[PDB]
């Protein structure tokens, strides 16, 4: 009778039940598997952790304790695979990477 | 009405990866939008995959294949590893 969250069963942070509800109410197919929400939650949790680690490193590199959109943009653009993943995504309050052409430099 | 979001979950993940790091409201909204976009992309990929195979059930294999198609290389490999571990430990208990 004692209830227990499905996320605790799989040791995940994102809620399995919410993902399952979204899959059911998203008009994808007639039925949805039991392990698909758990798998999607695990993938989303891994992506979130991966992006947040780089964001925190960028924030620490700027003597800051609170992550700002600038740190998120720097973390995304400084990672090649993440840059490919979000190649068509623009982040508000993110700016651009510092990049100056060599030919423009004086010599 | 109440608004649904992933703010607290992202906060918990941040505390797990960085105990002494904060997060701003704008960055929280950006993270929520990114999570929603990835969720939509993976769900659509899985739905289309099931549709092409005359199948009406999204299983773990559809999500795996969607992750392989969408995430480039090492991202997809780590994601499939984590998903396999999670589903195995879930179905083993």
């Amino acid at each position: 009778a004692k209830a227990k969250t499905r996320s605790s069963r799989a040791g995940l942070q994102f809620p399995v039940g919410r993902v399952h509800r979204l899959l059911r109410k998203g008009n994808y197919a007639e039925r949805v598997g039991a392990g698909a929400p758990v798998y999607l939650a695990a993938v989303l949790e891994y992506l979130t952790a991966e992006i947040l680690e780089l964001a925190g490193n960028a924030a620490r590199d700027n003597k800051k304790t609170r992550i700002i959109p600038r740190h998120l943009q720097l973390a995304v653009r400084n990672d090649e695979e993440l840059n490919k993943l979000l190649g068509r995504v623009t982040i508000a309050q993110g700016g651009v990477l510092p990049n100056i052409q060599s030919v423009l430099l004086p010599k | 009405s109440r608004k649904e979001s992933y703010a607290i979950y992202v906060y918990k993940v941040l505390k797990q990866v960085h105990p002494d790091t904060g997060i701003s409201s704008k960055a929280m909204s950006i993270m929520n939008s990114f999570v929603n976009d990835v969720f939509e992309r993976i769900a659509g990929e899985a739905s289309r995959l099931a549709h092409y195979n005359k199948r009406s059930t999204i299983t773990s294999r559809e999500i795996q294949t969607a992750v392989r198609l969408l995430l480039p290389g090492e991202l997809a490999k780590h994601a499939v590893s984590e998903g396999t571990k999670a589903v195995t430990k879930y179905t083993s208990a």
């Binding site: - | 090492e74 780590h78 590893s81």
Partner: peptide, 7 residues
């Protein structure tokens, strides 16, 4: 193979 992110 796992936990070997190139970054």
């Amino acid at each position: 193979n796992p936990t070997k992110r190139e970054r």
